[PDB]
Amino acid sequence: MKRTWQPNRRKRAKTHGFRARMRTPGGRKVLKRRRQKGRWRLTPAVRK
Amino acid sequence: MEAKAIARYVRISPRKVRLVVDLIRGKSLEEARNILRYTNKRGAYFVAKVLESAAANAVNNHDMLEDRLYVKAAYVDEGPALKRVLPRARGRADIIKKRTSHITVILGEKHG
Amino acid sequence: MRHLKSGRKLNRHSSHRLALYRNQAKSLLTHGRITTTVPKAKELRGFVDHLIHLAKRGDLHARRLVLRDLQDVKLVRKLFDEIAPRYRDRQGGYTRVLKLAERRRGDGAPLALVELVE
Amino acid sequence: PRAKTGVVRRRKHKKILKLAKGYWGLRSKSFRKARETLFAAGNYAYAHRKRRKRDFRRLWIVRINAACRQHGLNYSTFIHGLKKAGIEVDRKNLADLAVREPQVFAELVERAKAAQ
Amino acid sequence: AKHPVPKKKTSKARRDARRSHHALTPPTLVPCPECKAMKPPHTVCPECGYYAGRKVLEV
RNA sequence: AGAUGGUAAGGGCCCACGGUGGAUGCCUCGGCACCCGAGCCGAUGAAGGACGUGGCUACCUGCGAUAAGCCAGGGGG
RNA sequence: CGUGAGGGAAAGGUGAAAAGAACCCCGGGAGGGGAGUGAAAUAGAGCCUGAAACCGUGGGCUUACAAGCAGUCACGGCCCC
RNA sequence: GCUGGGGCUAGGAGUGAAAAGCUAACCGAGCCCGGAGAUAGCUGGUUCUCCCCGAAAUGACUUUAGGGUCAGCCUCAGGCG
RNA sequence: GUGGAGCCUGGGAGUGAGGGCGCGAGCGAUAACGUCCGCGUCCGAGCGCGGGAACAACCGAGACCGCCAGCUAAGGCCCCC
RNA sequence: GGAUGACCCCAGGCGGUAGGGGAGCGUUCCCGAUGCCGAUGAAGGCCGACCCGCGAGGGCGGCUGGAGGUAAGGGAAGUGCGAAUGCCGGCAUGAGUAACGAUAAAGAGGGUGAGAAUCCCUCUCGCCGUAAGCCCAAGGGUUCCUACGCAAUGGUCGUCAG
Numbered sequence: 001m002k003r004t005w006q007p008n009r010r011k012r013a014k015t016h017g018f019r020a021r022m023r024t025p026g027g028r029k030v031l032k033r034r035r036q037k038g039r040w041r042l043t044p045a046v047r048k
Numbered sequence: 049m050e051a052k053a054i055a056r057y058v059r060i061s062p063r064k065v066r067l068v069v070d071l072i073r074g075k076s077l078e079e080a081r082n083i084l085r086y087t088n089k090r091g092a093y094f095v096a097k098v099l100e101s102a103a104a105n106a107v108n109n110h111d112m113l114e115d116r117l118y119v120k121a122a123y124v125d126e127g128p129a130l131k132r133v134l135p136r137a138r139g140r141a142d143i144i145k146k147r148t149s150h151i152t153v154i155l156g157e158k159h160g
Numbered sequence: 161m162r163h164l165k166s167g168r169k170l171n172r173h174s175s176h177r178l179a180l181y182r183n184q185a186k187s188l189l190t191h192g193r194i195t196t197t198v199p200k201a202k203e204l205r206g207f208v209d210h211l212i213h214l215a216k217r218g219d220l221h222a223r224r225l226v227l228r229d230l231q232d233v234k235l236v237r238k239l240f241d242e243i244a245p246r247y248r249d250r251q252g253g254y255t256r257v258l259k260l261a262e263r264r265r266g267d268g269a270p271l272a273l274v275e276l277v278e
Numbered sequence: 279p280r281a282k283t284g285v286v287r288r289r290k291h292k293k294i295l296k297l298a299k300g301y302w303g304l305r306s307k308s309f310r311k312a313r314e315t316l317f318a319a320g321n322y323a324y325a326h327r328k329r330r331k332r333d334f335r336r337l338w339i340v341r342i343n344a345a346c347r348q349h350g351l352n353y354s355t356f357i358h359g360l361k362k363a364g365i366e367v368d369r370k371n372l373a374d375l376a377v378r379e380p381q382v383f384a385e386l387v388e389r390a391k392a393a394q
Numbered sequence: 395a396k397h398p399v400p401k402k403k404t405s406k407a408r409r410d411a412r413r414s415h416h417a418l419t420p421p422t423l424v425p426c427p428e429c430k431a432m433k434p435p436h437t438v439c440p441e442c443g444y445y446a447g448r449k450v451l452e453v
Numbered sequence: 454a455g456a457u458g459g460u461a462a463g464g465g466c467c468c469a470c471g472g473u474g475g476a477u478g479c480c481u482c483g484g485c486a487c488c489c490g491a492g493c494c495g496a497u498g499a500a501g502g503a504c505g506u507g508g509c510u511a512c513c514u515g516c517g518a519u520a521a522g523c524c525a526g527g528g529g530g
Numbered sequence: 531c532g533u534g535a536g537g538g539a540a541a542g543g544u545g546a547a548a549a550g551a552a553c554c555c556c557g558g559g560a561g562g563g564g565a566g567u568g569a570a571a572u573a574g575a576g577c578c579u580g581a582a583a584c585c586g587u588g589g590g591c592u593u594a595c596a597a598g599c600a601g602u603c604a605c606g607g608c609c610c611c
Numbered sequence: 612g613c614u615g616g617g618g619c620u621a622g623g624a625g626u627g628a629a630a631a632g633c634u635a636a637c638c639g640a641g642c643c644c645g646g647a648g649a650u651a652g653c654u655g656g657u658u659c660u661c662c663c664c665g666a667a668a669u670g671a672c673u674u675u676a677g678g679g680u681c682a683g684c685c686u687c688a689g690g691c692g
Numbered sequence: 693g694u695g696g697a698g699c700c701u702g703g704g705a706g707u708g709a710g711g712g713c714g715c716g717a718g719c720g721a722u723a724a725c726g727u728c729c730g731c732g733u734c735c736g737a738g739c740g741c742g743g744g745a746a747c748a749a750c751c752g753a754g755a756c757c758g759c760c761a762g763c764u765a766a767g768g769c770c771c772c773c
Numbered sequence: 774g775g776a777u778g779a780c781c782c783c784a785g786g787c788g789g790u791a792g793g794g795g796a797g798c799g800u801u802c803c804c805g806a807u808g809c810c811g812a813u814g815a816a817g818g819c820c821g822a823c824c825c826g827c828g829a830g831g832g833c834g835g836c837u838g839g840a841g842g843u844a845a846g847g848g849a850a851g852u853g854c855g856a857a858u859g860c861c862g863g864c865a866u867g868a869g870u871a872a873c874g875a876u877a878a879a880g881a882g883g884g885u886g887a888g889a890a891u892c893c894c895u896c897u898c899g900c901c902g903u904a905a906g907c908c909c910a911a912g913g914g915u916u917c918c919u920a921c922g923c924a925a926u927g928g929u930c931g932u933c934a935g
């Protein structure tokens with residue numbers, strides 16, 4: 001039956017994207033934390 | 049004088065090969081060859097090659113006579129197991145161990 | 161219980177088992193000698209023997225009978241013309257099964273050869 | 279500083295496991311099972327050390343009794359006779375006498391009858 | 395059913411006792427009357443192709 | 454009539470030798486604590502990256518189409 | 531692994547020096563046997579040491595009329611020193 | 612009526628032809644990180660050896676009754692004799 | 693009456709679910725391996741030992757270690773024994 | 774007794790849970806140590822029926838191992854595991870057992886190759902056909918084509934393959 005992951009790139013980018021993160025005070029902090037931790041990818045990679 | 053051959057990391061389960069190895073212990077080289085030839089098991093192929101390779105060393109390297117050779121000793125040890133996943137129902141995963149054998153054959157000369 | 165029952169099942173249903181026998185007849189009657197598993201071999205005997213014994217009859221009826229199993233007009237033509245006559249004086253036993261010495265590698269199945277007799 | 283287990287535990291286990299040689303299955307191979315068996319074996323020995331002293335005396339009494347009845351009297355009579363005679367040779371020796379030196383035992387039986 | 399399960403680990407001794415029947419019987423072989431090589435009886439000799447005193451098969 | 458042995462399909466205990474496995478000891482490029490030193494960077498586009506960059510180059514490092522490097526001063530041999 | 535915020539491992543050691551095993555043999559290979567290197571190769575790269583569970587081979591004692599927390603005490607038989 | 616794509620509404624909040632339904636495979640109050648080593652009068656666990664002594668399961672009070680405070684009973688040191 | 697007796701000051705506890713049995717009561721049905729007190733005891737902690745076929749608390753008896761020596765307790769002395 | 778923990782003699786105590794007290798053993802580290810043991814072999818490992826100690830332990834000897842270890846006397850602690858449905862890893866048992874994923878279905882001949890029920894070719898047989906055929910869009914991201922391969926992946930095999 002229909003499971004929970006139904007990929008959609010526009011949705012993916014418009015949600016967890018870089019610009020989305022930068023727009024909100026909460027999201028900017030995500031990027032701060034991820035950088036501080038040293039994540040290789042601050043934001044979900046998506047092929048546009 | 050003895051001659052030996054060891055096939056290590058043979059991808060077959062020790063318990064299975066021993067069944068075949070047991071068939072030729074203490075037999076003349078000629079008798080063993082006869083047995084392995086008509087033994088209906090996968091292991092027979094592997095045990096065969098180690099037997100021949102041991103007989104080869106006997107004639108070549110160790111100054112023994114093919115017409116005197118018998119299987120003085122033979123045994124399988126177990127080598128590192130290959131662990132693989134086997135997906136079961138309701139999300140559970142099992143772990144299959146694809147086992148491994150170190151087959152040894154040691155040949156001696158029956159004087160007379 | 162299986163008391164006094166004749167004919168193997170060979171793990172095939174009715175139509176498949178029949179097809180198996182027909183196709184093996186076509187194969188045997190075409191090359192004169194085929195290799196199969198010992199059980200299929202033995203069963204093949206009577207199935208073909210009856211076909212051969214009908215080619216010996218020669219009539220149109222016999223041709224139309226044998227054609228139900230064999231289908232191939234060319235083959236049946238070979239059966240009546242080339243095969244059948246060398247069994248004119250022979251009464252049954254037109255085939256033979258001889259068991260081979262080596263088993264199959266992938267499943268250890270015992271093999272044997274079926275052939276038309278000289 | 280840090281003092282990790284290191285060598286100590288393996289050594290303690292081997293002591294036990296060596297003491298458990300000869301036992302059946304994991305009792306001689308598994309440390310834990312070896313220990314449980316060794317506890318029982320310590321109590322058994324202590325108990326059987328104490329009871330070995332009984333086990334033999336009962337044998338001695340059976341044997342002395344066997345030789346006595348050959349001479350027409352029973353053990354309970356024989357011992358009393360010996361007491362009245364004032365003979366204090368023990369049962370370990372009486373039994374040895376009863377078998378190795380039968381004529382000597384005969385004489386003791388005599389003095390036993392004479393005493394009453 | 396309520397999922398039966400072993401109560402105790404099988405001992406090394408009991409495991410091995412169960413396997414007292416698991417031994418293989420060596421193949422039964424007779425000499426070929428033509429080429430003296432060993433082969434299963436009632437089988438066409440895979441070494442020389444002879445059965446019943448005649449050539450039957452290319453080897 | 455009486456009696457007492459060799460039997461091992463397999464099993465058990467001990468011994469020897471192996472296999473598996475990676476504990477122990479030794480080691481340390483790394484870590485930890487304290488003290489001292491030092492302490493801002495950015496529209497002259499930071500922090501951090503993407504993609505590139507080698508004769509042959511997957512990755513790391515370095516570098517930016519002048520791309521494992523260009524110029525000059527000092528150091529060194 | 532998780533849609534995501536986020537979670538989050540395992541994995542160090544040949545040798546003084548690669549001298550990292552030319553060549554020959556069995557094998558399709560893997561592997562092994564000789565040869566050679568080394569003080570050492572059960573230091574051979576699946577590499578220091580290499581414990582235990584666990585698996586096996588060989589040897590000694592033993593077991594198919596026997597009732598068991600498996601030991602313990604006694605005696606005897608057999609094998610060993 | 613069903614359905615693709617593009618959107619909006621969320622945690623004491625959303626949404627609900629109403630089942631406390633659903634809000635990323637457990638919703639009478641989602642998930643992650645933090646407070647946080649919350650708190651647990653409860654349960655479990657607590658690692659070498661030898662030597663001497665050796666209890667209690669009672670009383671009183673207790674939002675107390677399988678928890679406590681004092682008393683009783685054990686032990687060690689000094690003193691009294 | 694010199695005893696792992698007693699008294700005084702102080703350090704450290706643990707216990708504050710007891711249980712069987714005998715005798716004296718209540719409660720119960722002159723019921724319960726029942727319940728609630730009292731005096732004693734043992735088990736608890738002596739599931740160490742002999743007896744009771746077996747059996748924490750009934751009888752015997754308080755196990756520092758050793759002995760292939762002796763005497764007894766309860767209980768026993770036809771055979772198992 | 775002798776005078777003091779010097780050893781001897783006589784006597785009595787010595788079941789033990791919660792628990793109090795005492796004496797010790799061992800592990801890591803510091804002083805002792807610019808020392809001492811050490812390739813004529815450190816640690817660690819495997820043995821031992823030997824020696825000392827009530828015991829925890831400590832010696833000695835054999836094999837392994839191949840570069841560290843460390844006394845008398847003192848000091849300081851991440852200091853002793855058998856259990857926590859503990860944690861991490863390794864390996865067992867069940868057991869050569871269930872299973873090997875739609876009951877549309879196979880049979881022979883020829884080819885290749887060290888090896889073939891499973892790869893290629895032919896013929897026969899069966900299954901789908903409002904699909905089990907074809908073309909888009911999502912989504913996946915080189916899986917496309919060819920050459921050379923079969924350790925692992927493929928629930929078997931493999932010369933074949935995403």
Ligand SMILES: [Mg+2]
Pocket residue numbers: 006
């Ligand atoms: Mg959708």
Ligand SMILES: [Mg+2]
Pocket residue numbers: 007912913
């Ligand atoms: Mg996707």
Ligand SMILES: [Mg+2]
Pocket residue numbers: 008009010011
């Ligand atoms: Mg899109």
Ligand SMILES: [Mg+2]
Pocket residue numbers: 010
């Ligand atoms: Mg779209």
Ligand SMILES: [Mg+2]
Pocket residue numbers: 013014015016017018019020021
């Ligand atoms: Mg965005």
Ligand SMILES: [Mg+2]
Pocket residue numbers: none
């Ligand atoms: Mg800001």
Ligand SMILES: [Mg+2]
Pocket residue numbers: 040
């Ligand atoms: Mg990066």
Ligand SMILES: [Mg+2]
Pocket residue numbers: none
């Ligand atoms: Mg990541």
Ligand SMILES: [Mg+2]
Pocket residue numbers: 016021030042043044
């Ligand atoms: Mg993000």
Ligand SMILES: [Mg+2]
Pocket residue numbers: 086087088089418419420421
């Ligand atoms: Mg066979």
Ligand SMILES: [Mg+2]
Pocket residue numbers: 103104107114
């Ligand atoms: Mg040869």
Ligand SMILES: [Mg+2]
Pocket residue numbers: 138139
């Ligand atoms: Mg689940």
Ligand SMILES: [Mg+2]
Pocket residue numbers: 143144145
């Ligand atoms: Mg497994």
Ligand SMILES: [Mg+2]
Pocket residue numbers: 161
């Ligand atoms: Mg039927």
Ligand SMILES: [Mg+2]
Pocket residue numbers: 164165166
């Ligand atoms: Mg019939």
Ligand SMILES: [Mg+2]
Pocket residue numbers: 167
């Ligand atoms: Mg039929």
